[model samples]
Every structure is written in C-alpha cells, then in structure tokens.
Target: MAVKVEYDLKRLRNIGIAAHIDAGKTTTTERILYYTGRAAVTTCFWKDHRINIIDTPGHVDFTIEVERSMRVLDGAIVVFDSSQGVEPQSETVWRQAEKYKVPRIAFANKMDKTGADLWLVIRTMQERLGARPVVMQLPIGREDTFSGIIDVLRMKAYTYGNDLGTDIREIPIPEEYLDQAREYHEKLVEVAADFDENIMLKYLEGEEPTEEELVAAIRKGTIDLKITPVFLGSALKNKGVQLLLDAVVDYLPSPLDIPPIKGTTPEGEVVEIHPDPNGPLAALAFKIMADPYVGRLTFIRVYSGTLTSGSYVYNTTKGRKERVARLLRMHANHREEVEELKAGDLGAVVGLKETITGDTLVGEDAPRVILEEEDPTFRVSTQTIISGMGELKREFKVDANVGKPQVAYRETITKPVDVEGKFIRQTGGRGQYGHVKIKVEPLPRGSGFEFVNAIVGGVIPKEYIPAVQKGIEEAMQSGPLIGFPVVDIKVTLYDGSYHEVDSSEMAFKIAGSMAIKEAVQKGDPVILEPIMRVEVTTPEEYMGDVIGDLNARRGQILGMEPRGNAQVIRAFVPLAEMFGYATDLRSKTQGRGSFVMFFDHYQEVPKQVQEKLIK
Candidate 1:
C-alpha cells in the first residue's frame, strides 16, 4: 500500500493572486499552478484555467470582487507590470489588502516587455504602498529577451527553457549581471537576518551565509511581513515560475504561522480559536455559488481541526447542524472529490443547510461567531424584476410599467430626504388621532440603515412602536426621489404624540409616511449617481483624445501612469455615462486600448444631470 502523507495544516499555505487589473495577477497564479504540476493537465493558453484563482477584474468597477477575494486568502501574491509599477486601481487594491492585513508576495512581471523597469516598480511599492519589499530575485533583461531571474536568497541563478520543471536547470551567475545579483541578495539577507541576533551578527560581520540560513531567515522575515520577496519573470514565457512556487512553500504564512482566530462561544462567550488540527474544528464559509447543475456550492476554508466525509459539525455562524455530504478540492470551476480535508485547506461542500458567506463552522458545543468584512460602501439600484405585459396607465399610475409584465425597478437614494402624514378618526367614544415627526438623515455610503426611537413617557405607547418602523422600512423600498430601495440612511422618531387608546400602529404608520414625504421636500433631495473608478490604457499618441472623451462623460482624471507603449489614465465616471464604454473603448483604440472599471462611490449628480436622471 502506498504510504499517504497526512499533511498538517501548518504545512499548507493559502495565498491569493491580486493586482491592479491585467498587471498579470491571474497570469502569476497560472505560473504557480504550472509550477505545482497543474500545468501538466491544464495546458492553459493565457492564464490558469484550473486553479482556484478567484480571478477578480482590476477595473475599479468590480469592488465586489476585491472584497470577496481578500476575505479568503492567508496572504496574496500581488503582481505588477514591470514597466508601469502602479496604476490608479492599485490604490483601491492596496486599501483592501490593508483592511484585511493580508501578508503578501510581490511579482514584478513583464520584464521582457519594452518598458519593464524592475527598480521603478520597486520604488513604486516603497513610495505608494509604504512597503519594505525585500528583493528575493532580480531580472536579467528588459522586454523580449528577458529570459531568467537570479535568486537573491539562494545566491544562485536558474535558467528556463521551453517546458517547465522539465527544462528548468540550475546555472552559475553571468559575470556582467553578478554584481546586481549580489546587491539584491545582500539586501535580502540584511532584511531577513535582522530578526535573530546570531544571524544579524553574521550578516553584520560580512560572513558568507549558507543557503539554509538564508532560506530560513527569508521565510521567517516573509511571515512577519518584514520582507515581501520580489520575484521577476515573464508569466507568458513560463520563466521563473517554478522557483516562485518553492518560495511559496517556503514563505507565505500557514494557518499555524498566523495568530489564533477570535470568535464567540455558543452561549455568546468570547473565545479564541487556535490553528490547531487536533483541537476542535473551526472554519469559515466564504462564498455560496448557486449553479444550475451543481445546486448550492459553499466554499469553505478550515482554519482548525479535521473534517471527514460522513462527519457532522455545527454552523456556528448560523447556529445550525449540517451533515457532511461530499467535500471537494476546487480549482475555480474544476473540482475533485476528496475523502477528507485538513485545516488551512480550501474546499467546497455541497448541501450545507442555511450557511452563507462569513459564517463560522465550529464544534457544536464550542464557540459560535461570524467573520465581518468591511461594509460595502457604494450601492447602485438596478433592475431586479424583469417583465413584459403591463398597463401604462393603471390606477396607482406607477410610471415605469413594462410591456406585458411589470418589472420592479429598484433605485437607491443617497441624499437625505423626509416626509410626513397625519391621521384622525372621530367616529365613536374615543377619537383616533396621532402625529409623527421623523428626522431622516443619509448614512455614509455603505453604513446601511438604522431606526432610532426617542419617544418619552406618556407620548406614544411603546406597544405599536415596531409597526411605525416597519412602515418606514417598507416606504424606503421605493426611493423618495426615484422608485428604488433606499440604503445607508437613518430615520429617528424623535418627536411624536400618540393618544392613549385611539392612536395605534395603523394611525402611526400613515403618519410616519406623511412625515417622511414632508421631510424629503425640506431636505431638498436630488438624484445621486454611482461613480466608478476607471483605468483606461491606450497608446501615448491617443492620450489627448482619451482624456477629452472621458472629460465629456463627466470624468475627472485622478492620474495618468505610464505602462509600456500605453498610458493608464485613472478617472471617476458616472455609471450612466459608462453604459457602453467597454464597446466604445474597443472602437476608440481600434482594438488596441482596453479599460477596467470598479465602483468608486456614489456622488451627488450636478443639477442638470440630476434632472436628466429622473425616470
């Protein structure tokens, strides 16, 4: 029988491939997969079609992708184009990494591409990111002839031929490039050896360091994030990829390398979950994908304990029991059934009941908790209900009626608004009467909504309090300005009078609506628009034309960064003006230019633009 290696979670590392869009983050991930033997089966043409790459778009328009991808990785491999170090979206990605405190590795890719400048990229990292990136490797040449990289930590060089692993060969350093290689190697050693006194002394003494000592120090420094091991190669040519994998196994923090996770016990008691395989199992369900064929697939990463087929565990986040059906090791859309999964490993499970993103899965009798990512800041109201066949002039006279069926269009309001209503009935012994005055304020972009009650004694009885709030919530389903769900707003029932018997939930609800409408008019509300951060790459000659077009679309240029034969201009533009931008860009550069956009934030539309926005 073949002896199976029972892998410890500590030996496993979970890292992500992140970068400014098209900086080759996905390409780098493909290189990692190829190095680790996935290339043999995939034969991927452009990027890794077989890894759990979580390939998010770099364009600022897809902030959701950045949000979800960062939540799962232990650390990330941040790729950058050698020629153009940092783009506009780089700031957004850096913020996400900072928010998660994700330790990462840096890959300065496209060294062979015309503008590839290794030092420039490094300087960008240091200056923009405030990162102390220790150089682990240095590149040989710039553009096409860029063949190989010299390992700074190993104090050696590896040459790449055609086939990966098969054609890889260890070689001596070339005389001309030896000086550059030694300098980076020395810098790497200096950073890595600083954590230990003996090694520090050796480095200080200028002693010839052993490869083991250097590798150990490098790994140690990397885990502490004091060193971000920079590697250079062309992902397209399959160069320097294998050695990068070796570094991945050597450096990135494992669950064991990281600190214990914080959670709450089943009884709401706080507890710390260690990265212990033998201890009680704990994990997080990061994403739920509902497929037409696969049903509901929940991606899970176990931080501690062993979970096997036929075993059961508690969904600590949901406070429910889930049966272990089948555990799968996934590579994006690819899958393989595994008998068991160890901690720190990413896997997907089917048929987990009521589990969603950020939910904890732990021992039934242990702690229950949920992991929280930052609240999403910007929201855009879109058409959720689509239909045809509806009357244009109905009794309610809803303006946006579809053809035969009715499509529910949800528009989100960003500006502050208020309204008010009054109800009085004098039919019998006790007259039904109530008055409501609410103060509605806009919340920060993604703070969602809150209902605050400031009612005092002998005013409105507390019994029907919830009903008034419920009425307010329902009214918000259609925006006060346009017909859409209102988000990130707060409503406070600060001053209101309620009669002892006649004033009830019904009366208060009507009064609440009336109050909001009146307040909205007073708030002087106008339409708010979703603005996206966009990076457009085009040849230098067309820079003027590109900038002019974006300006016409109500865009404000943040910066223009150089990228090889192109200049990447970062701008904030309203989504309405960007409806067909992708296709338009294709025509603009005659298929030479491309752009990526992610949601930046919601901004107040100019008066004329706001008037045009009214449906």
Candidate 2:
C-alpha cells in the first residue's frame, strides 16, 4: 500500500491548533482543512508543504487532549477571540504550549464581530502571557467593515472573493491604512533583524531589506520563539483563511528545526533519536480514539525510521510487541489508507490492541521508554473498572452497578528509621541466607523516590547492591497503611551482610523488600488526599448561595471577582468532596452555574475524614 511521496522531512510541519474555549479553534481548523483540500493527506500543494494538524479541545475537562497534542507538535497556532481579548482558559493552553517549548503564532480571529479590538488582543497577549506580539497582518477594517487584510511584510492588501473565499487578489495597500501598514512593516523588520544574521548584517550597513529577507528573518525568529507573528481573520466568514495557511508554511518550523528526540532505555541508558528514515525505528503513540465501527485508532508521531503495515513493532511502554495491520493518514475522523509512514510524519494504526496514549512504539532492539506525562485520568479510571461492573437480572432485564469511585490517595513515611531484615532457609541441595540493614528517611513533599547506596568497605557486593535497591523499589508500589504508591521517601543502604554460596541475589532482594515493609511500619504513616482548584461562574444573585455551598463542602475560598455579567468564585476543595459537584451546582443555581476543577496538590486528610475513609 506504499504510495509516492513528494515532501521530505524538512518540508513537513506537525502543528497543533490550540486556543481557549469559544476562540474559534475548531472553526478555524475546519476552514483550514477545507481550503487546503486536506481530504486524503498533506498532498495539498497550497504551501508546497505537508501539514499534520491536530484540532484540540479547549475546555479544562479535556485538558489532557491539549497536553498530549502539544507534546508532539513542533509548532502551534494559538487562536484568540478579537472581541473577548484574553479569557481564563486561554492562559491555560498557552502555558501548556510553553511547557512543551512549542513555537507558536497567534491568530486574532472574529474581527467581523462587534466590539472586536485587535489591538486589545495583541496587548493582552503581551501583558497576560508575557509574549512578544508581532502584528504580521493588519485588518483593513474593524467589525462589519472588515473585508480584507493588509500583509505588513509585503505591504499589500489581500481581498478574498469567490464562493468559497479562496480567490485572493493582491492589491495595493488601502490608502487609509498605507501609513499604518508601513509603520508595522518597519517594526516587523526591526525585530526580525535581531534574530536573523543576514538581516542583521544588511541592517547594520543601512540597506533596505527585500520581501524575501523579511519572510526568512521572521521565520527564523518564530522558530527561535523570539517573536509571535499575529495574523487577523474571521474564519467563520471564510475571510483571510488562505493567508493563514500561507503563514503556516512561511513561518512555522519543520522537523529539522526541532532538537533530536531523546529517550531512556530499560537499563536507564539515555539514547538520542534523529529523524532519519535509515535510522532505528522510534515512534510515540500520543493519542487514542475509539472508533465504534473500527474499534480503536492509535495516533503516532514518527520520530525516527519508517513504520510499515503488516510488520511487528515493540510497544516500549508495555514491553510487548504489536502488529501494525493497517496504516492510515487521518483527516479529522476520516482516514485514507497509507502503506508506510516515516520520520516527521503522523499516521494512525488500527490493529494495535495494547497500545495506549503516551506509549512508545519502537523496533524490538530500540531502547524502550514510555513518553512522559501519561494520562492520569485513564490510569486511575482503569484501576477501578471492575468496581463499576453491573449485575444483570435475567428475568427483569435490569442492569446496574453502583460503587464509590476510588480516590487518588497517597502515603509517605514521616520519620527516619533504620531496620534490618534476615531471610534464612535450608534446602536439600543448598541453603538460602540473606541479611540487609537500611535507613529510611522522609523527603520533602513531591520529591518522589531516591535511592542511595551508602554501603562502604564492601558491606555488600556491588552486584547484589542493585538487587537490594530494586527489591526495595518494587515494595514501594503499595504502602503498609493503604494500597497506594509510596512517595517522597529516600532509602539508604548503609550496611548489610551476604553469604558466599547460599546468599544469592534473590535472597538479598527478598531481604531488602522485607526491610522496607518493616521500616514503613516503624515510621509514622499518613494518608494524603488530592486537592483541586475549582472555579465557578454564576450570576451575581447566586453568588451568595454558591459561596455557602462551597463552604459546606469544606472548600477554602481563595478569591472572588466579577467577570462581565457573571461572578467567578475560586476555591480549593478536596477532590473526594467533589464527586457530584456539577450536578449539585446546576440544581442550586437553577442551571445558571458552571464550574471547572484541576488537581492542585496532595494534603493530609483530616482526622475524622481519614477515619471515615478507613471504614
């Protein structure tokens, strides 16, 4: 099924469309895909470049989708509503992009709507996100008067015509905007000159820059994250969408611009993967979608080598091999059959039964490591799947299963304690004897796990030391107080004894595992429950009731403010107390209230609450 390819790695752009809710992200994406004729694949020749774009959700409830999409994107288009300027969720998505170090361009959309202020949107990006906003295009008019865009770099106006708004005619800058466009053009070149050596050299010698010079300079700055080129358009009206696509090809980086992807092997050895078709295969499965008709579709980003159908690849995250029965080039939910995918390409696989989001798929001999930032919700939900099973009634045909959802509680040791464990046994052929003494100490909150081999004078052989540490690490999966993973603890193996013939690595591993269990019991153990930062938006009249309800739930009020016609209440509440909060808030506010919550940190549960949880 392999097909002919036109673009190379350097001509590909793996970008994500991200924005706040109601900022026209999905609308813009739909328009972009249609205008580019993205039906089968990136075979469109509009920009002479191939683009793999993922339209991500903006709501906080679907934040994980945005997170995973950004993880693999080389660049992004951050859309902002011109009328609303900056919204709450806008900052969240912006931060996520920054976390991934993804270079981005901003789109000032909805200029045709009343109250649209492109300047305000630009200023808000600078003030709220601390980003350097560079205006690349100036809207010819505002609100209902908006019809065309003036490209500052080209100093020309582009008017959209035709039934589909794809016929773009380049004309002279409008007389009214000529002076302003020139002003921005100068500013644009001035900033670009700083990032591009060629432009800098030309400017230093007092030479006027050419059109090519400006575009290349801006592209360099955009890739370096030194500038954020802002484009204006009304996607819903289908105006100026084609130019945005042009900018995607003009400004965004290709795979060659990004650093090599690095990963850790099973033995903790770090390896670097270059985007090369001839190199070893290394790809990441970043997203998984359920297709009722087809079962599951796993989206993967190829960081190195080629992936072909009817071949087997290792699921590094799960340490298993999966067959690639089908390869698809995905366009929204629709897909086209493809035979092979290589570096810098994105495709979907249909026959990976065990592949999940954030799993790494590589050649069997390639180092295996799961992509970091695995989805936490899926992990916790899967842990309690059995509890949600329903009972079937044969006669009445009634089916229901009701159970309390599991809480993400954790446990950590409070104090330092030194304990010793001895495992001695005898068999007919040989005997088993192992002894180990280790010191356990508490670390700062969120410090995670730390292992130190403090053994000196060969108290224990080096070969057996790793086994001891591994054994203790294995035992850390569940704490003595509860079946929660242990965190924020440091273990030091200072002294231990081993027999020459009978004391095998297994015996020492057993001893080490036994020692940690006893040490945890000796040290004080406490349960920590997750806390969520919740924000509620409601009418002014319902503010008092909302505040009272949050207080009743033992929520600590952080702050409150007025937002347009509604009031926003921010509070910190225990996740356990927020099971049915959405339903309760709707009934309390007569369906006028809305809330969103995100995990903050773990805190010690109250004495009474801990007792109740135990019961």
Candidate 3:
C-alpha cells in the first residue's frame, strides 16, 4: 500500500546529482534517499512535496548520460571530492551543466578523509568553473576530527547521532569556533545583500535580517544561476546529509521556475510547452535500459499533462504511436508500480516498440521534435558508455560496406580535363550506340560532387538526362584514387551523339559513367583523410614526452595552456594515429593524463603515406 499525499505544484523540485569520476556522487545520493524516507518502504515520495532525483553516472565512459540528464533537469547537485578538488572529468561535466543553463549547488564530500580541505575545493571550483560559490555550511574540524557542521543560514551547530544520524540535534556554537563562525556569518549576509535589493535596503538600514530573509535571497540567486550555494558533509559517516536535503528543497527550482520547454511541430511551428497535468501530453524519454525479464525500460520526463496506463502516446523522434503498458517509480534497484504519472515527474514505461534513448513521447497532435547529440550524416553513429569495470568502452561501428575504422576516404581532382566516352555494339539485339563528351573541373575542398547539363539542342534526349546524372553519381562512389569515394568535383555534359533507333537509357548511362571516370583519371586525383581536433591534459613533467609522441603520430600542435598544476595541449591529428592512444597515454604519464577528440576536417595525406594507401 502506498500513501498518496498531494502538495502545491510549486513545491515540487527535480534535481540531479552529478560529479566527476570517483567523487562519491552515488554515495551522496544513497544518503539523500535514505534520510528523506523515500527508501522507508512504507512512504511514497511521488505525491507529497515531490522531489525527483536523477542519479547521473560519474565515469567518463558514460559521459553522454550526464549530458542528457542535464538537459531535462531544473537543478543539479555537483559533488566534489574534498581531497582531490577539481579533476579532469569534473571540468567536462561542468561545461555540460553550463551548456544546458541548469542552476546547481556544490557539496564537498569525504570530509572525514585525510587531507580534505573544504576551502581549497571551494576555491578551485570558483577558479576552474567560473562559478561564484557561496558558503552555506562550515565544517567544525579537519579530517579524522570531523564531526558536524555549522549552518551559516541559522548560525547554529548541528550534531548527528542515534542510528546513522536520523536524529540530528541542534546545539550552541562551540566556544572555540564562535569567533570564526561570526565572521563567516557576517560575510554571508554581506554577499547575500548584494544580490537582493530588499536585503540591501535592510542591511543599509543597519538592521539584522532574519533567517527567512536570507534564505529567500539565496534562493533567488541560485535559480538565476548567478550563485552556487555550497554545503559540506561526510556521506559515509551520515553527517550533514539532512542539511543537504534541506538546502535542495530551499534553493533548487521547481518545475514552474524554469522556462517552458519549446518544441517544433511537423508543420515547423514552435510551441511553448508548460507543466500542466491537464494540458496536451508532451514528454521526453531521456534514457533506455535493457532488462532481461521486463524487456526494455524507457525513462521519460513528463513536461506536460499526465500519462495513464493503457493510454497511447506518440514518439516524435520515431514517428510511431506506442501503448504505455505500465509505469513504475524506482529508487535505484527497487521499484513500485503506478497507474498514472503527472507532469514534472520521472517514470519508466514498459512495452515501447521503437523508443530508445533521447526519444520524445508526446501527444499525437503535437508531433514535436526533440533533438539529442546525433550526427545527422552518419549511417551508424558512435555512442560512449560505461563498462562494469568503471572504464571507458567506446563502441564505434559503420555500414557493412566499410571496415572497423570507417575511413570513408574521399577522392578529388586537382586540375580540369576534357574526355570522351563511346559505347557501340552490334552483336547486341538493340545494337546500342552512344557517345558523350564531359569536361571535369576541380572544385574547392568540401564542395562535393556537382552535375551540370550544358548540352545544345537535341544533343541528348530529355529522358536520358536523369540517366546521365544517376550514372555520374554511381561512378563517384569509388574514385581513381585508391578506390575511395570521391568529392569536390564537377562534371559537365556539354556534347554528345546518339543514334535515333539504337540509343536507349542504358547506353547513355554507360557512356556517361565511363566519361566521368576517364576524365577524373586525367584530372590529377588525390585522396583525403579525416583529421581530428584533439586536446590532451597532462602534468608538466610529462609535457615533453606527450608532445614527442604526438609528433611521431603526424599530429600538428595547435597550442597549449596551463591548467592549475597540469597542461592542456591542442592539436590536429589524423584519426588513424589515435586508435589505441589511450593505452599509450596511460603508459606515458602513469595514468596522469587524459584526452578528448572529435572530427575536424579532411586533409591530403603526405606522398609516402598516400603511396602505402594506394598499394
């Protein structure tokens, strides 16, 4: 039996817990779930002042998971390891959160570990992320002596005891820390007054603001994304967990606080969707997981209206209508069945036929479009995921016509040439006869292939023009340069002759195909390979070794930057040379460096490598 408790729509909050790899994001989430009584087995968190938490993956392998989650969340809790501060993966995820314009709070976890400096972590976040982090809580002591936290908002000390800190009792500020606590409190109010005009007036009048006034001002700043309210906790020790949850409800935004999600209809008209349970249904399925027993589960964030079991919804991404067989609310591994899900909530639906990750499920009448990170040109795209070993497993694939690397090398001409092709046969029943003169001209890089019809009166039949174009397109698939695909060239069919009784579409197609191949062969063909924009971050001690290794791989160094104690080097390198560079990098810097790369542009290969490729 589940208790159904209802609250004001504005009371609900949807937040995501995100962080760098090994930052205790998972543990912090577990504490929130337990302390909030969501895992008590007898309580239901869906209805009463609901706060849906999306626990995002921390491994760099599932990096896209963090990306998609950030897109839909109204706010997020960015956890940082107090010992290590800002790491490489942290910068990556931080940028994603910013890209989505999601406001956030920071938690300095692992305060019980040795060398845990809360101040250093706070400073690093400010410097690296360009975020104004405001102190909301102060730890009582250093690692090993860590016990509780002083709440700056209330100016009170909270000590945890009694069965994993389920019973937190407040006490007077300790005598040893009273002076420091007063100083921080004064600083907090001074900064808070700057953000809120009402608070500024109160402060200017030399009047002390109440707890409610300060909390209201901080809430406004956090939702505006101009301030990051920071908290401290030892999640494993069950200290400061409750206070963190309180900050989430106090500072984070509800569904109404964020801007309405906009989408386009099939007619290309944009619609502003709001959070209304009675409105037309508009929901996005952000993630999909395969289950052995229940088939595939599609997790959806309902942006508008309510979804009930047995109701049909349209998948805008796939353009198919699917039945919602069942809906389930989950807490990590455990789940409970529900009949209906309302807006501003997250739920999983079973029995979807074609919906995968990042699909939008909306009303059929809406026909909206929700775009994800999709390469529109790729026949089969690559997606990165996390493996069971907590390592990156990049799975890339292509069409059956190509091999693993999917080079897709293209060929083009460097000069112009005029050539003629003739198809004449008498042994055939129709006795086909056709001839064509084509002028091939080189085009600038990335121009692709173009076909021009410059024929004079009745030179080539009107019906045969399409055949010539088709033939030229087919010939461009494999070019004269090492049998790779060709691009950046134009062909003009300016002159041709055909016998009235013998000429057919087949004869003209053959002649056109032969003419283009012969013209490009004499037009100076060259092969092009795709180059990648790569950025590597490593310690200064291994900077020389990294640059030397990159040079050996035919990489062109673009620039370098100093990041904290590390260096980030940018380069343009051939994709072929980066196949197994991950393993080599680990061996070079003892796992102190990481790299990220994406497709940039194609360039001509050197003569030596071109020779090997042609062979």
Best by TM-score: 3
What are the per-residue Cα lDDT tens digits for candidate 1 across 185-220?
A: 777767767866667888889886778777787777
Candidate with maximal lDDT? 2
Order the numbered candidates by lDDT, best leading.
2, 3, 1
Give the TM-score (vs. native) of candidate 2: 0.66
Error of 1 at 237 (Å): 0.6
How many residue pairs clash in all the candidates, one count each?
A: 36, 0, 0
Residue-wise lDDT of candidate 3 within 39-129, one digit each (tens)? 1111225324567786565465344565677766788888899998876566656666765778788899999899998888888887666
TM-score of model 1 vs. true structure? 0.62
Write the candidate numbers in order of decreasing TM-score.
3, 2, 1
Give the total clashing residue pairs for model 1. Answer: 36
What C-alpha lDDT values do all the predictions have?
0.66, 0.78, 0.77
Q: 1-615, model 2: which lDDT tens digit per residue?
A: 123547588888888877777899878988887887741122233566778885465454354566667767889888899998766566656666765678889899999999998899998888666788898889876798788899888888987664367577888888999899889988887888887777777777877788887888888888887789999899998888888999988988889887777888677877777889877788988777776677677888888889988899999878788999998876544567878889888877889989878788987566565545233343223334432111110101111335445566788778899999788988563787778898999999888888888889997878898788878988888777766778888998888898888888888888988999888888887788878788887767789999999998879999988654467899998877877887788788765566777677788888788777756
Misplaced by over 4 Å in model 1 are: 1-3, 38-68, 162-166, 266-269, 291-293, 331-334, 373-615
TM-score of each: 0.62, 0.66, 0.72
Runs with alpha carbons beyond 4 Å of true place in candidate 3: 38-48, 60-64, 161-167, 367-406, 412-523, 531-615
